[PDB]
Design a binder for this molecule. Sequence first.
Ligand SMILES: [Mg+2]
Length: 1051
Amino acid sequence: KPYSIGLDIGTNSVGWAVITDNYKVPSKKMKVLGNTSKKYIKKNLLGVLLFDSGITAEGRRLKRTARRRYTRRRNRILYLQEIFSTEMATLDDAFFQRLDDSFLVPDDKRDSKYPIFGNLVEEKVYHDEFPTIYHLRKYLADSTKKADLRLVYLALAHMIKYRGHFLIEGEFNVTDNETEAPLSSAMIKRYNEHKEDLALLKEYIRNISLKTYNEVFKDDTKNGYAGYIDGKTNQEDFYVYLKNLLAEFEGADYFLEKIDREDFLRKQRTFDNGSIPYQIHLQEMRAILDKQAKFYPFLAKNKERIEKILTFRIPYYVGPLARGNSDFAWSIRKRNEKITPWNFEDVIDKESSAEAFINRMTSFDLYLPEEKVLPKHSLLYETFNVYNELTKVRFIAESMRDYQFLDSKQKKDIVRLYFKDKRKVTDKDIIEYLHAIYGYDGIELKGIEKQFNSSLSTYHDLLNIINDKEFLDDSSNEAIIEEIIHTLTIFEDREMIKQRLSKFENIFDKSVLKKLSRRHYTGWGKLSAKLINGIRDEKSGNTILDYLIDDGISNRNFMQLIHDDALSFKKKIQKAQIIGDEDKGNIKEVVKSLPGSPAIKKGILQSIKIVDELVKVMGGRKPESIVVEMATKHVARLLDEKFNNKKDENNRAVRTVKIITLKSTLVSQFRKDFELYKVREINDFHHAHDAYLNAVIASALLKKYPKLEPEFVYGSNIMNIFKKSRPLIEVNEETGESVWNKESDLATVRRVLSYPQVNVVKKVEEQNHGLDRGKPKGLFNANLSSKPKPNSNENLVGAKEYLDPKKYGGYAGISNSFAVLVKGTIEKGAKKKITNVLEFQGISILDRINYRKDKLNFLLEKGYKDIELIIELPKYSLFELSDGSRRMLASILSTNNKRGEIHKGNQIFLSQKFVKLLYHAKRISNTINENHRKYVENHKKEFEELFYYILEFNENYVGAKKNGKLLNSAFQSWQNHSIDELCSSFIGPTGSERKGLFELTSRGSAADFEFLGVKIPRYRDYTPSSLLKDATLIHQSVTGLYETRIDLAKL
RNA sequence: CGCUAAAGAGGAAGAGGACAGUUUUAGAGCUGUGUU
RNA sequence: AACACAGCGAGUUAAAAUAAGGCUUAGUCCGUACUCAACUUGAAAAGGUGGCACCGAUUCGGUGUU
DNA sequence: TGACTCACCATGT
DNA sequence: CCTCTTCCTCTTTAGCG
DNA sequence: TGGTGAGTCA
Ligand SMILES: [Mg+2]
């Protein structure tokens, strides 16, 4: 029997359905391997495959660039330290050493607690004389007195460590008029104002009430000044709290005004220091180096280098400064030396690296995939475009009947006279020329509406900048012009643009040269120079451009030149293109590269895998059709490649399987007309129901009207034939062929939409990113947690391994990659007594590699004197308990084996009578449908049976009891409560995408819901040791049709 | 279905740089009393 | 000597880290992207393994056969 | 001393 | 939050296999 | 939405 696959490719789901005949999904008994007693499990061929959504690489890119910037910053400080090392060693041996051990607790510090000066008194004096670093920077910048070298290094390292934004280009040099340092003076002003205003607010809040004083200033937890300085509060929250407190108090207008202008007790380091140019820091740096150079000689020699450390930005075109082994770097080194900031010009070739940066990402031409595309603004590309549009210009003749294309000489004269004269060509100018050259008047133009899309913009621009028409006119100079446009396109920095442009300096003038240096064009074309001009045809010895400009017989567009049988352009392109044989091998490689975000790419790859395994399931008989709907078009191409690869002859490729792309509206139209409603909340069976329905629709549409088929198949709607609003049986019109029967086939459609069994599968993944509230997370939390409590049990990853997590605080939230079952012998009961213990051990993403290197050693470090088997369970591994409860194992906690997050794999099935009610309930607030209101008003008695069914399903397969009791207590108000609240409680708010009562019975993680005004907490207390007793691990396949039940008890 | 160009709209990949946030330490704790 | 109860004062900043880390790959580089049912040939590229029909549906069950 | 409960929280412009 | 670069995709126009 | 700290009971 024949069969046709259907598919629902999607971001988080792929739904697969197989139809043999008469719109029916066949049932096949699939063997079950493993230590089980169920030899054959009979599975319906409806199915779904659920996967975690693919993640874009933006977060990885942002964290990679951040990582690199921290590394480069520490390298800049190390550079300044190597500059200061020889002279500082006499002043203080361990100043750098004391700075490096600032994090450490006093005992673990190598020399002293006080970082800067190493003794209590001098540190006290430093903080007294300069309360903040900005006072120090101002003093060094403006005081012509010898400074302790430590202080100078601290100021310079403050500027290098925190330098300003580089957006402003040029040289940049406030209320203060005499100071060298503007920023230092402004922040010293903020220091003084904040101190004085703190004193005044202290007096006021204390005087009204001492309790307010204590709460605001001496209680860190609150949002007051104690929260502002020694807490997690921010300016906005502190202002809100202060205004709320101060509003009641009488006469507190000064503080309220300053808060209103957002300048009341401001902090020197604020989110508002972002808009500070680096030139301000450089102005301070120059002053400090200059004034202290006279006293310290080494500063005079290294003054240029110290500035270079601050102002050096790795150019964007010169990427990561690798020697290789880096996937992202493109830099092309010219020497072998290490890349210090001073020698970056020497070591690296900026021209070659900048050219590689653009040419690595440019696209090879499709027609002849061996050459790079021409620059978008090249004269050749425009001249190719201008003629191509101009050739097909057809003018209606006032007297002559014939509608005729432009003559070649007319094309030459038109382009010369007008296209070169004016940037924007129109219809009117061409009608004028045609009237001038030919006496006919009243001519209109075809192929051209109003302005020409094509223009020689580059010709006019280069004419003005060059200031010479003759240079553009001459064909000999055309190669020079092409090289000029190439250097403008590839190179973006004006310096290197003029550097390469200096080659063609003899022809032009320097003033013209610089003006050309300003002009940079962007973008690249989709054709190549060799194609347009290099390729030739033997019979005429003419390029494609030569034919477009002058093809005597008629004006033919570029594709017509390429495809014409007489011309050898088609032979040339085919020769080159099958020289370019890049099938890419495995389907993984081609699927990775199709257009889109990785999220859809995952769906596509899994859809190919489902189709392959479905072919294996059905006996190896290739599908009669496949119907991808994306309810992706790239799949159609990919599925065409694998299935329709075979060609009877090299001349053409035969097609056997019709990859089909139904439009989305068809499924919705069928669903609404015949009331096969979908509720996304109830169960995940809707993906499979959608796939089966579209398989049915596509089969019928191809069955009844073959005429539309060519459009529908790859390479007044049709839904009316599904509508009988007509004889009982529908048969093809104009021929005798099978068409869908109006009632009997509908019976099969509804029954297959009321099948309890759908082979739902959640792909077992070994996680690499932890998940918090749906946002990816790494190995652990990105923010260091506070120091543990004095007598609190914490599993904190240290900041660095040499730093103890207890004393120095640590990282919390270790994410678990997977969990391994370990049968073996464990010391238990403190007597080391042997036992046959089958218990999970969770493995973190942190130590995944360590586990993989030696599984036995990792498991043995955790006990397990003898290990006899290690079943390795990825996330979402499925256990079916004895009762019939399926508990997918999300993870086993790394810290504790006996705690883990277990989802619920059981999917509730609701009869059609309930599903209609639920769909109506979710759509109640919708203004469009009165029928929803009337149905929910007429069938309120369904709600009682629905609640009881959800609660019994909760009782048997789910394990929630307290939530069930709260739900039962809440439901007693069913007879009298708001119908809007009844519906929202059962299904959810309209459009919320959050389920109501069905969040108790949905698959996956449990989430909080509100039922009739009662907040029901999420049930997350499934225990990981309940899986082990009397349950069977199910190793389902990608389709889910093929499973291996490894019973844990016999194991 | 595949192309080229124009005006619109929306993404993807990559490079460079800034500001904050978090953690520990250094820079403010002192006095009277309860207390073992 | 330490823990606390009350009173009175300071509070703005600096250093270090900012995914743990890995390497003969030692770079001013890489470390959250894509890939991953089970058993079994596979160093690896890539492959192999699971009969059909019929009646029904609270998750698949029961039949007829080979 | 391990199942059965509840509460807090997490990097962004 | 700022600067830069390329590659894609969707509807519509002009030509087109 | 997943870690997991902390509390009370058989
Ligand atoms: Mg690092």
